[PDB]
């Protein structure tokens, strides 16, 4: 199985993408053993980005690696189509979209039509990113089969029965979990891996959990999984999307600028408090030889 | 109380706002007794519109009426602030935002900061548009009290207890419901009225329900309400946001073009089947002398 | 519209129904203007009562008034049938049942069969008590119409659209709300009234809210409604079903014994704390001349 | 890990526990490799049974095996305490309770007191049976830690994160899942196994999934799992608790009488249609040499 990072988008003080910080972060992630980078996901604040910003992110990350899944979706299908088509000039893994968000009670016919439209125009394999809490809709194993053109799916949901069902109904589809707390479990149960937001700040931990599980060292894999779970819980105190920036600076040693408001940056005191919540975990990970002293 | 229309945004086949059609619609609504127009709401596909497009919408409607609440929110706070500031040049009722949508588990402090920032820059009264199913978060009466700066709230939720709590905790706040099926009830229980999506296509019905409820003619109000409910249910068959275009054409008699995909337009067969579903209701409404 | 009390079942220290405290409470409620008494409801801990206890409660309340809706439901249909049939010798308003509880994913056919069975054997009008949070199922306006034998429905749900739908689809059915916070609203919108748990301890307030609303004094009705709402909120601090006993003793001036564990009684300190939460409301209600000084 | 059967309670036409049929079932289950039997669970209609009937059940099963977890909970704490105490005379694995059901919004303190009271009187290890959809409340890993006295937990919830949290916060607790569709996964991820309702009718399949998962033959485990999933889905068509009777008769070849109404038995036509649905699955299982 694979660990895929939904890579953070660093912003400058003046609310523009910091392309050079992004390239530092991407190179570090690939060097630490991350399989692929998912660009313009939730964690990268993709719904907060304009189409031109989504393209700028692709271009910046592509200067580092071609192992990229390029998220292109949004509420203007013409923009999503234009991005999908532009990707023809890049040697990437695939394009991706979440379901159309905000609007409740969308018909199944319209949801299917949306995804089939993107598959129609895509010069690359297409990945479904299912996130019912964020979008308000579920594109389950049955609907995914009906659509019929997906290479893979990332399922962000704690219900692993729903995730397994993709494999059951679509045996040749790649099936990933969006649940960081399930890296060990996903590896152990024959799924294809995780799109792990926490791999931005602890790529070492996330790849090691998977490795331990695949080496049949389940107890060791779970001990590490439970430490990673504590970091995730700490990130939720001040807001995980904002906290992710602080956690990456802390564990990885380079600055990632700011998020984009309404995803507000942590202030100096909140940053100090968050670091106090995780520094003992850092010490433990140094002691396990997972992180360099 | 009031009826406020979350006005539909008509689009061209090539996905541009059709300003001509929008003005025809706005003029008819005001003519038929609608109190105010809420621009760039869910029903107007506000989340599908860029900041310039939200401004384009305000401009077209402002050519017709100043009775406007202008929704400016989005996932880029700088854009929302810019729209708030540009509204200074428009003699309107207020501005509004939904909560930041998509992102789950946003901190209460961050949600409060988002709305307080908008209040700090606004040249007009600010309205909260609360829609937990759409946005993934609830800015309830307690959070609204903490924010402290709202002139009014529209609450799109089934739970009228939740709506009444805004009045209980914030007694000088204007409090509206977003549930079209509660026009009669909301008007009878001392709240300020409804932002009624169904008032796009049946402004006559929604205004009459309000009037009857104000007169305490609750039995007559409910009979009409229950008919409006049946048209709402019919609109859900193929998708309400799309069906609203077809129903406005059918009942009001002018075309409103297309929605914006992935809000796909109904096809010919769907339109035919929807009309079949509400044909009888129209007949009853003409009999009751509500429609011509 | 009517105010109906889901009457509390008082228990002795040795976990038996205190029949004499029950009769004191029932007489007070009828004297304060309560229209009918719903016996063996949630508030009376009906699901915690044996069939013989359910019968003992009917008999005790019947010594005071015949204005009773007799709840008979449970997970043994033979017991529910036996109780329904026994009611033939009593001049009561009707029998009632909640949906079968605990078991999730019950078929619509089986739910309909349950209620039609009770209607088949009932010597009295039958009332549906719909409480989706407590039972796990919804018997909505459509299913109620399908069943076709209900005289009335109590809908415990904050969604008043669902409650109105009973009237819409079943125009001749009596339709009550189970939401105490909606007494004013229910009265004002043409519904038939409320089964109000808070009328155990403040029957005066609940009947006055309804009266004010029907006198077209909506602002005055809402001011009182909002005070009642504060008492309900206070009752939830220590657990409303347990707190109800303390609140009735406090406002009405007689003891109601104990609830039945796992509905544990408040201890002396919790009782002291709860009274401190509501005593200012009591003072306000005395000042409004709703409660006697 | 283990497979534990929440054993079906067979009833007569006149609504009495059929003790003879129950013993035939228990003997077959143990014979086919089931590790323990959980008596008076949801699947055995435990909430529909009086305290004496729960005791009747324990007695019949105890005639066959002592590998029993005995569920004693209900809405009368004195009855539950009495059952806990009477279990002293039975050499069993443990006792168990669900959370008090029906009543919404029970205080955390009251929930904790309920379980601690049972622990204080129990002559055996105590197991938490966590089933939020059924009971209306969640006794999660944090509440279980606060209670402090559980030997094990069965968690009936979709969310395996929630189940793994019991191990994380309570590392010496036995932790089981109640989701039959997760037998393969639970066995592979270091948890203690499943209390599997489908092991009533296909004990061979559930025990084989466990074995294959233990051998790390995950692809083979999942193929079998996915077939068990299809039989679970078929059982939902007419209602799982009722369908379980018919499926046990079909696959295991003895009659289990009736459920207790309002858990109504399937009629002849329903049984025929259910059999049609799982006939093909049986054929595949015989081919795989899992069934005769």
Write the layout of secondary structure elements.
4 copies of one chain form a homotetramer.
Chain A: E1 2-6, H1 19-31, E2 36-39, H2 51-62, E3 68-71, H3 77-86, E4 94-98, H4 108-121, E5 126-130, H5 132-135, H6 141-147, E6 150-155, H7 160-169, E7 174-177, H8 183-188, E8 193-195, H9 203-214, H10 218-238, H11 240-252, H12 268-287
Question: What are the key terms here?
Answer:
homotetramer, alpha/beta, TIM Barrel, eight-stranded parallel β-barrel, 48% helix, 12% strand, globular
Question: Can you identify the CATH class of chain A?
Answer: Alpha Beta
Largest interface: A-B, 38 and 38 residues
Strand content of chain A: 5-15%
Oligomeric nature of the chains: homotetramer
CATH architecture of chain A: Alpha-Beta Barrel
Helix content of chain A: 40-55%
Q: In one word, what is the shape of chain A?
A: globular
What is the tally of helical segments of chain A? Answer: 12
Helix/strand structural class of chain A: alpha/beta
Q: Element order, helices and strands of chain A?
A: EHEHEHEHEHHEHEHEHHHH
Radius of gyration of chain A: 18 Å
> Numbering strands along the chain, what is their spatial order in the largest sheet of chain A?
1-2-3-4-5-6-7-8
CATH homologous superfamily name of chain A? Aldolase class I
Let me know the largest β-sheet of chain A: 8 strands, parallel, barrel
Fill in the CATH topology of chain A: TIM Barrel
Number of domains of chain A: 1
Distance between the termini of chain A: 28 Å
Count the beta strands of chain A: 8
């Amino acid at each position: 199985p694979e660990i895929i990072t939904p890579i953070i988008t660093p912003f400058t003080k003046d609310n523009r993408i910091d392309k050079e910080k992004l390239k530092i972060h991407a190179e570090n992630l690939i060097r630490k053993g991350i399989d692929k980078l998912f660009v313009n996901g939730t964690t990268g604040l993709g719904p907060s980005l304009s189409p031109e910003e989504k393209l700028e992110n692709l271009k910046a990350v592509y200067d580092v690696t071609n192992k990229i899944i390029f998220q292109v979706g949004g509420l203007n299908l013409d923009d999503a189509i234009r991005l999908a088509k532009l990707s023809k000039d890049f040697d990437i893994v695939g394009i991706a979209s979440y379901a159309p968000y905000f609007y409740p009670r969308m018909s199944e016919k319209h949801l299917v039509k949306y995804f089939k439209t993107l598959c129609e125009v895509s010069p690359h394999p297409v990945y479904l990113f299912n996130y019912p809490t964020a979008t308000g809709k579920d594109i389950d194993a049955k609907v995914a089969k009906e659509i019929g053109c997906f290479t893979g799916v990332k399922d962000t949901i704690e219900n692993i029965i729903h995730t397994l069902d993709y494999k059951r109904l679509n045996p040749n589809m790649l099936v990933y979990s969006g649940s960081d707390m399930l890296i060990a479990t996903v590896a152990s149960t024959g799924l294809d891996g995780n799109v792990a937001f926490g791999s931005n700040y602890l790529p070492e931990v996330t790849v090691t959990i998977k490795k331990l599980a695949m080496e049949r060292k389940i107890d060791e894999a779970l001990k590490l999984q439970f430490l990673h779970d504590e970091v995730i819980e700490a990130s939720r105190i001040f807001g995980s999307l904002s906290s992710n920036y602080v956690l990456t600076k802390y564990f990885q040693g380079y600055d990632l600028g700011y998020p984009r408001p309404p995803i507000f940056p942590l202030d100096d005191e909140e940053e100090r408090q968050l670091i106090k919540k995780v520094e003992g975990i850092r010490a433990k990970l140094v002691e396990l030889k997972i992180l360099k002293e």
